[PDB]
Amino acid sequence: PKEPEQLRKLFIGGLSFETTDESLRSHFEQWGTLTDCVVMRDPNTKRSRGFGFVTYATVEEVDAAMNARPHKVDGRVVEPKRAVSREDSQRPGAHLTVKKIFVGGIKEDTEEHHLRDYFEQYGKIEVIEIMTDRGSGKKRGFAFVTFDDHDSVDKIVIQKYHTVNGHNCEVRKAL
Ligand SMILES: CCC(=O)Nc1nc(C)cs1
C-alpha cells in the first residue's frame, strides 16, 4: 500500500555546511512526515558534504515540498531533486536535470491542445513542438514539451503510463 521508498526521497543539494540532520528535518517536516532525513558527511572529519536526503511518507508529500520551492534552509537556497529511473539518467547515480520531454506515439491526430491539457497538470509549459515532416508537413507522430522547471519532467518520466488523446504514449527526457 505504501509507494516505493525510492519515489518518496528528495536529494537536497547545496546545503549550508552548518545544516544538521535535525535542522534539515525541522525544515522539511513542514511539508510532510519524514521517515528519514540525513546530511551526508565525510567519514573522517564529519564535515558536511553539502548535500543530504529526506524521505517522506507519501509521494503527495514530496510534491508538496517541491511545490514549496525555493527552499532556504539554514540561510542558503538548496536544490531538491526527486529520483528517476536509470533509463532517464546520463550514468548510474546521476540525475539528468532537464526541462524537456520527448512524447512519442501520438500519431497524426494529436494536436497541441491535447498535449497542453494533459501535461499542464505536471508543470508550467513554455513550448509545445509537434513534429512535422520537413518535406511534406505531415505530422510525424511525436512531439517535444518544454516546461519551466525540471520537476515536471521528473514526475512525468517516472509514471508507467501516459494516455494522451486516447494513445498510449512513450515519454522520455530530451536533451
Ligand atoms: C548527485 C546525485 C543526485 O542528484 N542524486 C539524487 N538522488 C535522488 C534521490 C534524486 S537526485
Curated annotation (Swiss-Prot):
Crosslink position(s): Glycyl lysine isopeptide (Lys-Gly) (interchain with G-Cter in SUMO): K107
Location of the RRM domain: 8-91, 99-175
Region Globular B domain, residue ranges: 89-175
UniProt crosslink position (Glycyl lysine isopeptide (Lys-Gly) (interchain with G-Cter in SUMO2)): K2, K72, K173
Signal sequence annotation: none
Record PTM: Sumoylated.
Residue segments, region Globular A domain: 1-88
PTM-bearing positions, type Phosphoserine: S16
Localization, UniProt: Nucleus; Cytoplasm
Free-text function comment from the UniProt entry: Involved in the packaging of pre-mRNA into hnRNP particles, transport of poly(A) mRNA from the nucleus to the cytoplasm and modulation of splice site selection. Plays a role in the splicing of pyruvate kinase PKM by binding repressively to sequences flanking PKM exon 9, inhibiting exon 9 inclusion and resulting in exon 10 inclusion and production of the PKM M2 isoform. Binds to the IRES and thereby inhibits the translation of the apoptosis protease activating factor APAF1. May bind to specific miRNA hairpins.
Quaternary data: Identified in the spliceosome C complex. Identified in a IGF2BP1-dependent mRNP granule complex containing untranslated mRNAs. Interacts with SEPT6. Interacts with C9orf72. Interacts with KHDRBS1. Interacts with UBQLN2. Interacts with PPIA/CYPA. Interacts (via the RGG-box) with the HOXB-AS3 peptide; the interaction inhibits binding of HNRNPA1 to the intronic sequences flanking exon 9 of the PKM gene, preventing inclusion of exon 9 and promoting inclusion of exon 10 which suppresses formation of the PKM M2 isoform and promotes production of the M1 isoform.
Disease field: Inclusion body myopathy with early-onset Paget disease with or without frontotemporal dementia 3: An autosomal dominant disease characterized by disabling muscle weakness clinically resembling to limb girdle muscular dystrophy, osteolytic bone lesions consistent with Paget disease, and premature frontotemporal dementia. Clinical features show incomplete penetrance. Amyotrophic lateral sclerosis 20: A neurodegenerative disorder affecting upper motor neurons in the brain and lower motor neurons in the brain stem and spinal cord, resulting in fatal paralysis. Sensory abnormalities are absent. The pathologic hallmarks of the disease include pallor of the corticospinal tract due to loss of motor neurons, presence of ubiquitin-positive inclusions within surviving motor neurons, and deposition of pathologic aggregates. The etiology of amyotrophic lateral sclerosis is likely to be multifactorial, involving both genetic and environmental factors.
Identification of the protein by name: Heterogeneous nuclear ribonucleoprotein A1
Organism: Homo sapiens
Higher taxonomy: Eukaryota, Metazoa, Chordata, Craniata, Vertebrata
Residues of the full protein shown: 7 to 181 of 372
